[PDB]
Assembly symmetry: none
Homo-oligomer: 160 residues x 6
């Protein structure tokens, strides 16, 4: 939700979740809690490669963790990470409470999607709506900082 | 490396056998599990880790091996998982066929076969059984 | 002798725990079994015998321990039967309490406690773990 | 008495946490130690003693607590050991479960939990946190 | 203000010592860290923040001090960052030399020196120790 | 070896040491350096109680220090000390050089046992032999006084 205090700014986790028979690829910036999500045509390495290339063109992605889905281990994804200078790590780090960061984000996202599903004709719309709600939510964690603000602040300081 | 093992599941008689192999010595541990599930695998691995100094485990992408329960066990035990023995499964099945008739249940035959594989004199001279080798390797390492 | 082991059953939460202690080293193996029977005891014994060179097993006159099914396992495995581990049971139960909350089923808590006991370095001027002593003892015996 | 503390070791995630409790205020200091050994405990106690006026330490007969290294530290520090909190370990573990997901490593989560336990407002009004209490007790005592 | 602390790294025997001084009182905390990194600095800072009410930390622009990992700790702990302790480092190193031979590792000698500095009564007409002033200052602030 | 110049005559320390898999209970009169040792069947509070009762029947034992072994903290030992008028203290006083009096005696005794082990069929014999050698050894400390002579001299003066 609000990220992990002991993580580096270049660490991300990715995974796919499922809703209404659709595939939702989710990425989470571990240090901040910021996510990017999107319904993809098929749970393939091709679709996955595209999403990683987009993410890398906007953020300074150093390391990505994913489980061992064939889509995540495909040569298309491997090729994509290599081109983008991304170190791929297989297996989502374990956490006794959340089970895994991306894991808790998949659940949070589905929960949010359930609250606003009534205000969207298409699931794809509800997905972006939920991501918006998640990223803009501010909580006492940091003087009223949202995950969307934390990530740009974290990356900006790194740059500076 | 003395702390490296490879796990995998194999099938016989419509049943599932979880197999563990100490890469350095060829030592084996196997068991018929009621279902090819993460909780059965996590349990097996936990027993194995409390007996041998397990540091790294290599497996295929099998759902049971990529499961959270197994991930959780390795986390508590200090084991690093790796994905990516096929002959051990073969040898094991061969030995099982050899002693199958000495037991009604495959679970018993599997244990008899592990016993045989780990204690069987190799090279025509004692001291080179998979079971003697692992003990020497681990000891020469501690 | 390094081939000697003591076996006995202990109980917790109304469950039976079969415990095996390598007398010479203190190393142990334990497991919750569905029943205090020769069938369960024999199966446990056969697994144990397949990993360590067991030559002699000392147990009480427990009904499951004096079973022909356990006797057959010993015959097959070449184990001598004779009718520390007591202390070991208290020792084990103590570690289980420390990790009990940490596991859902006593089953896995027992394995956690075994792992802890075998890999914990103490005693004898504090230096080795029971898991190191058993391998050293036996390997030396082999050497 | 403001100079009395109780130490003890507790376990979580296959790791060891050394816990120190100021009996008078309930203030806590904990840390994941690499091994339940006397040198790790003596070091922890030494840091604690150079910060708080530690006069007496109560512990169980744990080998690390009955160790010479620890005995030597208490000797140099002027601390009197006593043998013979269980709830503090419980509370600590509870708070750790509450913030566990905010860190990858338990060592970080433990410190977050100590922070939380020592600074958490109690009674619905400020000034009664374990951390505020110890400081007042020690000060009212010096 | 009683919530202000100065932090900085000093070196001895090729080892890094992270030092924290409570500006208001002179009280200090120091520790040999494996590395001059934000990860080590953040962890040290989180422990410090859990025992004293830290509000502001003044450090130089040291790479480990300007790290996002240390920034995150401060965010989490509610600490303001701003980029005496210098003198404190000389002071500390001096006490370390007096007890160095007394300890095997610099690690424990640093803690011995900290203990000595905080509990030694001097200055201001000679009367209180830095360990007494910090508790009095803060508690008063609370009162 | 030759005791501590600042100790009282009623102070003793006890501990168990180990040799050839046997348990050796050792007692040392701190003021003199005099020891009594003996192989015991098991490191129990029962065996320990017996040894304390023997010691107390011969010497004016006022205070005994021992570490926290279960044998030393057992109610049998507590009961024994109470009956004998012995104050039990837990934890062997620390000494920067010897680590602890009984500690250095355990090492001295093992060293002596090692020198004469060849002249004894049984370890139990070697143990009494080593105690004899230790207690009768005289050194410049006091005009040629051995620890065996120092203790009787110390206790005698106290009585007188
Ligand atoms: Mg997935
Ligand atoms: Mg497979
Ligand atoms: Mg029984
Ligand atoms: Mg304890
Ligand atoms: Mg600096
Ligand atoms: Mg002792």
């Amino acid at each position: 939700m609000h990220g992990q205090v002991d993580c580096s700014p270049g660490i991300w986790q990715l995974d796919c979740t499922h809703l209404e028979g659709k595939v939702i690829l989710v990425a989470v910036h571990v240090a901040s809690g910021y996510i990017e999500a999107e319904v993809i045509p098929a749970e393939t390495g091709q679709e996955t490669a595209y999403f990683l290339l987009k993410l890398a063109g906007r953020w300074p992605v150093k390391t990505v963790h994913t489980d061992n889905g064939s889509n995540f281990t495909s040569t298309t994804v491997k090729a994509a990470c290599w081109w983008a200078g991304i170190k791929q790590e297989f297996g989502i780090p374990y956490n006794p409470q959340s089970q895994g960061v991306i894991e808790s984000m998949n659940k949070e996202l589905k929960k949010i999607i359930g609250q606003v599903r009534d205000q969207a004709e298409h699931l794809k719309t509800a997905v972006q709506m939920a991501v918006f709600i998640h990223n803009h939510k501010r909580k006492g964690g940091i003087g009223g900082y949202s995950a969307g603000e934390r990530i740009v602040d974290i990356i900006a300081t790194d740059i500076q």
